[PDB]
Amino acid sequence: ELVMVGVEYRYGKAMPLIFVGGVPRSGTTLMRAMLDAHPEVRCGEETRIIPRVLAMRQAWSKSGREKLRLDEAGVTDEVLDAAMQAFILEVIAKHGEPARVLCNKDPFTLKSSVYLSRLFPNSKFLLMVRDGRASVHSMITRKVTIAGFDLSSYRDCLTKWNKAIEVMYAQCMEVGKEKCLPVYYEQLVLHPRRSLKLILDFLGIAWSDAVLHHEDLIGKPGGVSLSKIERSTDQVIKPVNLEALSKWTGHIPGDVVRDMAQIAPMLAQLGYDPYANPPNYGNPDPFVINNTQRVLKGDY
Amino acid sequence: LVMVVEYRYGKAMPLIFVGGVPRSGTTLMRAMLDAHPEVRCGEETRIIPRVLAMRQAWSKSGREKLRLDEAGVTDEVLDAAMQAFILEVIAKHGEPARVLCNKDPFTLKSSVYLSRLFPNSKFLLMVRDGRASVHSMITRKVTIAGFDLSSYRDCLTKWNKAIEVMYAQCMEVGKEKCLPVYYEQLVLHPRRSLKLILDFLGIAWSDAVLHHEDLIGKPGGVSLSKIERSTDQVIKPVNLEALSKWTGHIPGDVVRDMAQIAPMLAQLGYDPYANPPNYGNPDPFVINNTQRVLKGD
């Protein structure tokens, strides 16, 4: 059990970790900011190296032949997993301040939630879900690069968003209700209080009001560390606001609008109507309305 | 911390890294160390070289390093993560012993880094005539990503840069921590060679290092992967057969350009124009071993 000071926090393979993820441009940075604002919880920035080691270890088990040679070298499943456990945990524990509960956010780690679940048996998962039309519009207009995605094409990007979340959602389902919770970005934005109440319950963390005030805790002790070169940063410094839910509408080429159901059958499966262009995401709490007016007033 | 007298594994533990360019006597070396009751190296882990290459990548790349820094994934964190991954693989992939060891050929490209991570580890770098190493990899088809087995010139050129790096790292680590071991000297004089090595390692003599092949399959002994390409050679005792099989198999243009293609040859004492160099005189011990191998013992 490695130890850090900054009382003294003790960390090990059996501690309760929070893993946030989803398809990038789905409100994952917002979600982890809101948790970082809980005084008991640190998520911190995207580590990058964790999904990288996870890809590598994936390749090794994916090839039957490589698996054989590893086994023959005494590098078995148990040895790999122990090395993974140890590697991942150092990065999570030490890449930011220490805190009672530890959290990680690297969006695609969620393609590996059955695995991480196995490695860290008291860790839980928050799968951020957002209308893929919104995420794809986001990745395209902001030019946020994701390996294999062609940013010149909405049809390609939605086709791949579809595949990414189909896999991520299959994983979430497989670990189950107690261990993985899907969180809708739009419901989170319209209804932050109720969302965070339900999220903190699910995680078995006592409520704290500071989850609703993440923007007052940026750069602050026990607060929210932001990398200035992550693409979500300029958005996450503001309070939960409404501007980004629906702005995708009308910026999708007509042919893709038309094929939306062939292209992204995961929309329907997740409760986004593929022919509703846009869906009615619902109605905001006065809290969010006020936050949004503060943003327009220019208090950030 | 515990491997499982109860040895505990940790950053400060005594550790032996064996390596060098593949087909340089690295398996033989580690099998001879494995034979010692107080040492365990075991098979090539394969994944240790991969995580190190990864590490060596995120260093050079500016854009990537800047992103990791700004995320708080600093050198301090990466190094701690690397340390723990490596310790786990090394410690858990074979039986326990007072002195743990790892052989994976290319790890020796990062001996400076590995020495920083494990401040009590030492390094044995295998050195063998590049012409012998290359001819070995071409004729036996031992594949290394990025070496073109269809070209002596290419493989020689990449042996050269590989060993240049490893040797420089060995020099920087210092002579207290890294010992170049010349394959051809180890074969010619096993006992003299192993005497110096063990000394250097601060470990005591044992006649068992001179009889590695009697300890194959046995406990506290030498464990061989049947897929590893060197395995059929390491089952035999230290013998003279493989010293200069390369002679005459080098294309004439590569023979002409040898010093230019492989300046490391002359640097490490191999005359790039001797075909082959005279490596020395064989001990009676390896003369006899050689004689048993030809009859089929």
């Binding site: 990288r52 690069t145 990414a164 693409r231 | 790349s61």
Partner: peptide, 9 residues
């Protein structure tokens, strides 16, 4: 060189 905001998916 193959640097992207997300390199593994």
């Amino acid at each position: 060189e193959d640097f992207e905001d997300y390199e593994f998916d």
